[model samples]
Target: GEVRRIKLYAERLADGQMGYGLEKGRATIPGPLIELNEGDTLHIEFENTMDVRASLQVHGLDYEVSSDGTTLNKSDVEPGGTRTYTWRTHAPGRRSDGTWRAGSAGYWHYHDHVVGTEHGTGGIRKGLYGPVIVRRKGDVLPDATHTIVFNDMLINNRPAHSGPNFEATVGDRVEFVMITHGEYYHTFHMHGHRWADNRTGMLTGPDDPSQVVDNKIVGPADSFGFQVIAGEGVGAGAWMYHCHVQSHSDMGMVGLFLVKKTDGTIPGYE
Candidate 1:
């Protein structure tokens, strides 16, 4: 119900990668997390600090063609240029035909559409993407949120075997946005936790028919999210979340969900 504005910067990193950040010189792999409520409008004042043309293209939201962030639309920013991309969201309602319309609420993502190829393949490969979450009214809020991007053969563009691990305390409400990119299909698995396969990854009620799952198959541009009570029934420890593809895991697409006990200790993990 409110109009919001934020500044986003696309910059080249020292590591030969590109990323989106809220501030200059602070770009990161997988960019920053963006959250919004249904019925809200967001205006991104996108700045391109790179020497090449870049853009901010988003998925699963409403926007005019002018904000399409593509070479075809000419909405991409030139080097040292800036553009404002307006995204609007609406709530579910009944149409004039009496059919139900789905609200703009889900775990979505954004990326560059004009970086390398016409599709920003080079940009995304080098790390010009991030997660976006739009919530419906009355949706439950999480205590913390983390993003896990299964990009190519790596996680969030990190070196194989290196982890972008997450930490939490027992009983905390933890959320994860899992996204996949590149050529291979992968199955994301988390130890000792499960979530429903619905919009919010939580069951609606006792009668909710959503199947509970601990792993999911994903491919390029596919994304989903779930929230779980850390150590709810499994207590605290170092749990692993990884790509279940045998070769992928063997090649190091893995990380940890380091849930600590109330006393700040993880049994069996030093």
Candidate 2:
């Protein structure tokens, strides 16, 4: 296992929203992507630069009460205050009782737990969340990684009818971390790509029985990830990824997966 350290900041954006950023004054919606390996420990130095109190709470990882990042535990940071939160992960192993334990390796996320409401409803609503991925040893790596967050009626806090489109090149191995937040349940659908419903989103072998899917159901705080070979069988083009819910897509919950040819052009896309 390795020990890692990072600095995180919560700041107010010009649009009256809040965000998390690795550096000061560069906060983004959905924050930043954080990656780690099983059996790793991370210590985050969190600073709240916003006027309101905020916190850092994570999912699918181990942490003590002091690092809970909740108002109940008094782990939230006051305005202009700072704190250190430590998170730990462990690999799968056999228990002393001979039972197998699952490892901490999967698509996970973090968010503010104390802003606006005790659960950070105001914080998350304004935009203070990010993706975290934990991988097992020897896991296959991807050529690129992207994150898609379904927050209520919006995607990654973008306005309706807008897109934070993703790009890729044919034959590239691309990864996507899909997360859902806020008050709605959504069906995530992507065109021209499919992935196995298993760890790493790929089948292990010829005998592997994981279901292949292009659409999935997700709810608040739900997260999953998958990898696909861009234009594996289909050619490069503008692929639409959207919420399959009739009203959702109609109301502008959509984006594009812009896979291009080696020459950097997307056919039929101006």
Candidate 3:
């Protein structure tokens, strides 16, 4: 396996100045995407610049006990301290024949599992999370890709489902990777698209071969993905994608998705 190295820092963007947030470069809430291939070695150097202790907790990947970033171990890093975590990528699922499966690649999430007495106020619940994607060697890239996570029922930090809407060309392939934070049971429902089996786009696996549906239930720390050619049934129009839970959608858990034609124009725009 080849070695892939990168740096991530726990930072804060307050006090009138932007400081290190999650990863080393950006001051965003969630860390940067830690992307890797199925047979690569990942070496992440974590630097904590925040005043409080923080660490990274990974999900959907294989690692050794020493690399586990949960609060249970010595994974927590003090302010100005640094630690490194290593992982071996075996995306989707490993086959019984000992071959790594790449077609099982899809959207995965990671967060900071380190916290003090009040877990909710720190670590993951406090906006220390990010998305991870494992691309198969031969994958069909989508024309548009978006990450829609439900933490506090807010997409892209907009409450009341007032988050911005993403777009796609009618015949283009689009993918939405949805994840859940906190204790709510969320399901991502696209108005007119349905997909089942593995979350990887166009690459179905034996993991869960269920019939396609408009919505699927997702709980805390769980994620799901869907892909479809825009305008599969409904033509150019403005559609809504939100949590299926009545209360959740009613409580600011919805957003708009506009499907356009191949002319780089959206409905109701031109």
Candidate 4:
């Protein structure tokens, strides 16, 4: 079986729209989460959907400089053109030592890497990219799959959640993944509950190359993993998570999380 085509797009402004809509650009990674069985060939493709020419840059993978999407240049792919990359998978990790450290992890986002990046991640849109979880020889499969992919928390600019601010119910092992798509740097802070970085396996910022996966810190795009522990039949009244940037929080970047009662183990903070 093959991995489906994932698209990333960058749409220009309709007319006179301003701000993000000024250029009215957005990144798209349209895809299929096809579970790959062993000995499967993963054929991934990209379709450029932007008025301007753009290139696709997949982090950690080797590609031409122009294809890297980090300079003043770009490969002009017409408004509707496609590019494909194929590879076969036997296992999902480092093969040399037959280790678990090589297990599949992190995301692979794409962008134009050409002109007009400030307005937005041109290449990122038109369905730029998404995560790739490579299952190694030995790994655990959850009862059900839960995906928590998201863009930057513009907390300094915006926030998460719509209505109840930020609400996470009990029995829900809330995993938070925030990506700072197409912006600079900003710190993310949790409100009620505390979370550690699971992707890097380290408390501090990712130091190793494997953990260097993009989006861990505030930047062009920040992506990090978090958790809200609310085991089955247990939780609290409400919890909150927000940007550590006080200004941003006050500006409306803060939100409350709902940790449904069943809340117990009433004790200390280790």
Summarize candidate 2's per-residue lDDT along 87-175 as a digit string, tens digits. Answer: 99999999999999999999999999998899999999999999999999999899999999999999999999798899999999999
Stretches of candidate 3 off by over 4 Å are 14-25, 91-104, 116-121, 201-209
Candidate 2, which ten residues in sequence have the lowest lDDT sum?
A: 261-270
Taking every candidate in turn, the Cα RMSD to the unseen true structure, in Å, is: 0.8, 1.0, 3.8, 7.9
How good is model 2 by TM-score? 0.98
Candidate 3 residue-wise lDDT, 198-265, digit = tens: 65645455665567678888887787676788888778777788888888888878777788777767
Native-vs-model 4 lDDT?
0.42
Supply candidate 3's per-residue lDDT for 96.
100
lDDT at position 220, candidate 4:
57
TM-score of each: 0.98, 0.98, 0.83, 0.57
Ranking by TM-score: 1, 2, 3, 4
Candidate 2's displacement at residue 106, Å, is: 0.5
What lDDT does candidate 4 reach at residue 163? Answer: 22
Candidate 4, residues 38-84, lDDT tens digits: the string is 44555445455545554444443334454444444343445556555
Clash list (residue pairs), candidate 2 = none
How far out, in Å, is residue 257 in model 4? 3.4
RMSD of 2: 1.0
For every model in order, what is the number of clashing pairs? 0, 0, 4, 39
Query: Residue pairs in steric clash, candidate 1?
Result: none
Between the candidate structures 2 and 4, which one is better when assessed by TM-score?
2
Residue 232 CA displacement from its true place in model 1, Å: 1.4
lDDT against the true structure, per candidate, is: 0.94, 0.94, 0.69, 0.42
